[PDB]
Design a protein around this ligand. Structure first.
Ligand SMILES: *[C@@H]1O[C@H](CO)[C@@H](O)[C@H](O)[C@H]1NC(C)=O
Lengths: 22, 48, 28, 48
């Protein structure tokens, strides 16, 4: 019934690949 | 599984040739593969 | 007491930590 | 033959100023770094 803004939420891991400092 | 030998591998459908040694990298308990800036498989976890 | 949002096809730049943990993603 | 000492002092000061200028400014050696970066970028694109 109300409205807000998503500051930075909603980021998930795209796949199952490990990456280090990239 | 053999180590320190140039041996073809078929880890869970991932196929290639190389030398398989011990890794000190830390994996989150959902990641299977491992890449780098060049985007090549650098480290893989044992399916077993 | 909950929020609902819809996903759209975007392009994102993600920064992985040495221990491969996503920190501070930036939109495009 | 008349201003030998003055000229020597001027040269000595100039060489020190050159050393300080090279030490301080990091963008002086732009060309060599650009060549290295271009080669690295070409190799990275080729492998990618
Ligand atoms: C990464 O892993 C190492 C080793 O477990 C740990 O010491 C460190 O705190 C972890 N996190 C960061 C951000 O370095």
């Amino acid at each position: 019934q109300s409205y807000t803004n998503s500051f930075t939420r909603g980021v998930y891991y795209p796949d199952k690949v490990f990456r280090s400092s990239v | 599984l053999v180590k320190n030998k140039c041996v073809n591998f078929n880890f869970n459908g991932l196929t290639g040739t190389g030398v398989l040694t011990k890794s000190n990298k830390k994996f989150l308990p959902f990641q299977q593969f491992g890449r780098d800036i060049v985007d090549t498989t650098d480290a893989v976890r044992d399916p077993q | 007491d909950y929020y609902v949002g819809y996903l759209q096809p975007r392009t994102f730049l993600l920064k992985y930590n040495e221990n491969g943990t996503i920190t501070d993603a930036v939109d495009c | 033959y008349e201003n030998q000492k003055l000229i020597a002092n001027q040269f000595n000061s100039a060489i020190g100023k050159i050393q300080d200028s090279l030490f301080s400014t990091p963008s002086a050696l732009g060309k060599l770094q650009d060549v290295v970066n271009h080669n690295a970028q070409a190799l990275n694109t080729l492998v990618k």
